[model samples]
Target: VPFVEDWDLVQTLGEGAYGEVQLAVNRVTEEAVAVKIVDENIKKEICINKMLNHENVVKFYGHRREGNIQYLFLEYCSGGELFDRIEPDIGMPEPDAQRFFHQLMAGVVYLHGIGITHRDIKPENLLLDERDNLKISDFGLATVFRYNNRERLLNKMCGTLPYVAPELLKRREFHAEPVDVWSCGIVLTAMLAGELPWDQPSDSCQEYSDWKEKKTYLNPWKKIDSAPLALLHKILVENPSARITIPDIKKDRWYNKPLKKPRVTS
Candidate 1:
């Protein structure tokens, strides 16, 4: 077997709600890598279907399922978790966050472009390569776009609790692109703010509704002027249909220059 011939198990890196990831070394190439071992025929068929040709997305090198233990060989990214980088830092510098955000958007935009939607996009799912470049991971809930099926409302919610979209809660019909953008917007906020916007009742749906209706909550990051006002305004638009287009973001003022960097201390 290709895997048996040149692969050597290194050590277990960590485990998640779905599976465990391990560090490994390719005996032949002597290359370091990560491997995720999951169950065969698990709850990943639909979600993993959309990740056919995404380079920025996780590279699935190979898989071997002996009975129910499914092992997935993958590219190595040593920066650990994206959440670990943001949480302790009270938010990353605007430039650095912006740089990462650009990469994140590129990955998501690629998904959308290929007629697929990543139902789950968050800090936790973003992994960094050795060069600190980002790779989108954990496609356990994505879906291929179906224009005809989207006409009806969907009731199932298949993602982490905090980052879910508003309309998804009510089991209402909504555009997938905007919904993905909303999660990306929240993730941007979390990366910079180091805290959740609506972890409690103060920012609940009702309160957010009131603020949204009056546009009072527009530009919640007003005190933080790192990013342009227009950029933030477009991301959190109340009406998804009227929100900024992907091409529009490419022209945003922040994209012109490098993003801000953060000062790290531990």
Candidate 2:
């Protein structure tokens, strides 16, 4: 296998608990790539990423090992994380947000079809390339499920707190796909409202209360129509069994709305 020596490090992209990602250029073709260097075992991340192949899913090139470190090469997205583009208070335009949400669901549905669950589905894990196409990244917390079994439950408690499903927060075995569907609802809300529906879930939380009562909610969608709000309600429900599935989300009239314009490409 080719080694990391074949690429020239351009700069550091980001760092994490287990490794650092660097912007690198291929020595032979001058093509750019993101190199994830991990000092610990990356077996799970590598295996999960290798099984994924979709337009909205980040592409994994290959890996090279050097002593205690493992270098994983992946497609570099210059547009950066989806979180960086949003405002702290105003969020994004409705059409743009819906376009992103649609692409997100496409990728996630593909993952679920392949029996892989991306335990982390926050905005930070959603990346954009030069074409403004969204790609799901960071499969470190991803796990494979039995695609044929609808009753399968995953007990592992992992992922960002705010984006975790209510069932997961309740400390019970949960269906992997529903948890991902719950996180997608959270992401959609953040994109439309520019803030989380709630800091955390509780029976008596103020944010959840506001969300439950859409008529008086004090956020971007405070004045939104019943169509979108009703859709959100279905996705954010406390019961995992009652949560909207990916196919149902695609079938919603609001989800099928045409984008007025393409996303910004710079």
Candidate 3:
């Protein structure tokens, strides 16, 4: 009850490297929320999310500070982390992946359209509600890249290793929108493969380099179904300029396919 003035800490939800997250309830209103306690980078986390309003984005309620510590009030996602849903090496069912992918696309598209980019877009940062709907969260590294009719380039490295765009790690100026698209491609790969395609997309990783050669498909790709793999090929482009756009992703044949209903066992 002493964690913050208005919220009572119910339980610890996460102890991530950068911060501690806890489940809490408002003392007066009794509303449930996820309280992310961090020591720094609270500005961006609040700045980007305060202005964001989307079904796929985790709603930001408010924030409070205790000197060096900061508390972020976020919508409680009872379904927990999307990373927990992945089967690892086997992946989840096609329907679930597709459903989550669509929600993620909506979130990513909205962010890009508004000129904001989520530097980190991995499964861990993707939360799910009790109904299993996807919600994008954790925007400590988010930034506004488009303003005054000009796009901005991000050189400061900020993202999970495997999910980051190649240009950022390679020390090149990268457009915010394409960098996000690249991360989306990695997220989709993880959703389908239940594992990262490579440690990093830089040449230092042989698997990534091999992908560049186009001689053959690799791990997740090797085992992936062709229909979805077709989309991966378009999204996971080495050159940012060649990467598929949001609208086109929505138009992909596989992306538009209806989810198959589960067969009832007799």
Candidate 4:
């Protein structure tokens, strides 16, 4: 087989929700690579990957098919998932968090610029490059949510690992752009708090509404500084129509402010 002949498979990387991933080494270059092994159907995955070209997006080397299996050779990201970089109840410093958030937003911005909306933008789907740069991954569930000027109405229930991701997405006819924006807000919160505000948005989001309407900060909201917190509050809106747009997010005062402490350059 081309896979066995070209690269030597190492150990399992992850038991993926969609397919299996494993580390491998190219015999010639001896470079590290990850392979996505799935069944016969991955046409859309291939289609979207070809359309997408960005520094923050994961790079795929080649796709070779043998028999009923398809092997998609992908670039290796030693930094693993963005999930690991997070502190789990203790977020990293603000500058560091902002650096990564900028990188993630850059990638998301590129994706939408090309009219492809990532239905899933959770931390798990965000990978890190060797230098800790954010890279978008896992396009198995990605759909062309927009085309030219006409947008598509989402009918499928997204696997919004973020509580707010699925909670706000619970509509028979919803736009895809807001879905991704909402998820980014959740990721922003997760990055800041080092944990989600709540696992179930259905219950806590009501309280969240009370906190917002009444002008009180919730527990996790308390962790963020005033500037970032206010920006996040706009993003975490209950109504998609009212939620902040990516363009507006880029133009936000906090987002445009220079980092007090210099980190890595995007």
Candidate 5:
């Protein structure tokens, strides 16, 4: 096959160490699609992961390999990365943020229900499909639960540096699920204030102690009037056990609000 297929590669959407994605037009459907071509090794991992289906997950179509180049097909999501849409907003409205949060939580909850844990869950990994809906992607670091390996602990300190929770920094063997929750809190803060609750230097032992106490300021937490302050307390809990669970997030009052109808229609 030629380097270029019948489909037209319109524009480059995104790229990473693994590979790059292109927004292409399907000559047949006359509709736009995201064509992500990755290295053979990375494609294999993604292919296996796409098999785990969830409503909020990026839809995986199939796989194709040309000579040394391999392609993992997926549904088109032109809205781009969640961070792109949110960074400029800075304190996205509670209703809008809640919609995104609900979608993210629903997907994560589905993964957990199926015994799958997404070791990496951050803004970049969360993409928006054509409908402006959040779709969780990039499960290259995912793991599954098994009865015989219930004690299995992960030591690999993989994930975005800033999003890595304190316990993981201590090199402690912990559940990946809880780490995801911790990151969610940070992401929520970002959605609200265009910044995380705790920065690296400020998240240190002394500052963490201050943060642990009620005296600590969440930095921008108080600044964003719409974000429910109580939600932050549960998510940023000192004890992992008492920390917000997936269910806790679902039941959050912020997420309970009625949703708005999409602006665009077919």
Candidate 6:
């Protein structure tokens, strides 16, 4: 393990409420990594990151502390955030969107299986590697829940506003897993249409009425032919109990469709 002073800070990657993320290189190995330097303690994020060992999730290297600043060493996702690539109204190719969505589900499934809930699941939290593969990042709002009982709800109003579930907005105790599924639906819509289906703070927004009637909900199909409309419908359901789970998502026909393998970048 390297000390906080052992890594050379290359550049600032991003900033958050607690700290800033920086691109850093190990002096001994010459390997590049992303380091999150936060003033507050990150015990929760550290615990979750260390427990997870999935390809679709960001890899945790090590951590250190210098005075009040805590440093978290992570895999450097060179391609940047997934949100940067999506363009409003134009969106992305159907195949490309599907590939990213598939990877997102895989990561979610893994986290769920391990009793972890990613309270925040949005394009901004997803990073693209050099190969264009999606990696779930930012575990600051993640939590470990009791999976034995579905009715046991987690009472935290965390996560991005636009991506927050309706149940959460209502201030009702909400199940951990379904909220992630709802966010995934919003993310899929953004990937397919380059815009959110509804306004923030509630899924009962005016645009949601369009979804309820199924009138303009399929509007995204106009641009993308191979879009997973059926799956989106199931996932975007307002009721958490009625929403499609990760297992159901894997069994979806559109999700199983053949596609070109993801390409690696140099």
Best by lDDT: 3
Off by over 4 Å in 1: 1-4, 40-51, 87-89, 147-155, 200-223, 226-229, 257-266
| Model 5, span 86-175: residue lDDT tens | 754376766777788889888888877766667677788889876779998866676664335464666767777556666677646776
Residue range 1-266, candidate 2, lDDT tens digits: 45535889989988967889999997877889999999912798988887878999999989988998999999999999999877777678878888899899999999999888998999999999998899999988888876565546799889987898878878668788999998998888888777886776665677776666653457646845556667887898888898889889999988987755546875
- lDDT by residue for model 4 (131-222), tens: 88888998877888778778887777765645444434456788778778888888888888887765545534565555457454566777
Q: Which digits, one per residue and each the tens of the lDDT, describe model 3 over residues 1-266? A: 46345778899988856789999987877878998988836787788888999999999988888898888889999999999999989888888889999999999998888888888898988999988989998888888898787887888888888888887876667788888888888888888888888998988888888888774456877767888988988998887888998899999988999875556886
* Arranged by lDDT, best first: 3, 2, 6, 4, 5, 1
Model 1 quality (TM-score):
0.80
Shift of residue 24 alpha carbon in model 1, Å: 1.6
lDDT of each: 0.69, 0.84, 0.86, 0.79, 0.71, 0.84
> What are the RMSDs of all candidates, in order?
5.3, 3.8, 3.4, 4.1, 4.1, 3.7
What clash count goes with each model? 3, 0, 0, 0, 1, 0
- Model 2 is weakest, by summed lDDT over 10 consecutive residues, at 215-224
Worst 10 residues of 3 by lDDT: 1-10
**Model 2 TM-score?**
0.91
Per-residue CA lDDT of model 6 for 164-241, tens digit only, reads 888787766878889999999889888888887667735456666667777652565455443388888788777889
Clashing pairs in 6: none
- Best-to-worst order by TM-score is 2, 3, 6, 4, 5, 1
What TM-scores do the predictions have? 0.80, 0.91, 0.90, 0.88, 0.84, 0.89
Pairing residues by index, what is the TM-score of model 3?
Answer: 0.90
| Model 2 residue pairs with clashes | none
- The residue ranges of model 5 lying beyond 4 angstroms of the native Cα positions read 1-5, 40-44, 87-89, 145-151, 201-210, 216-218, 257-266
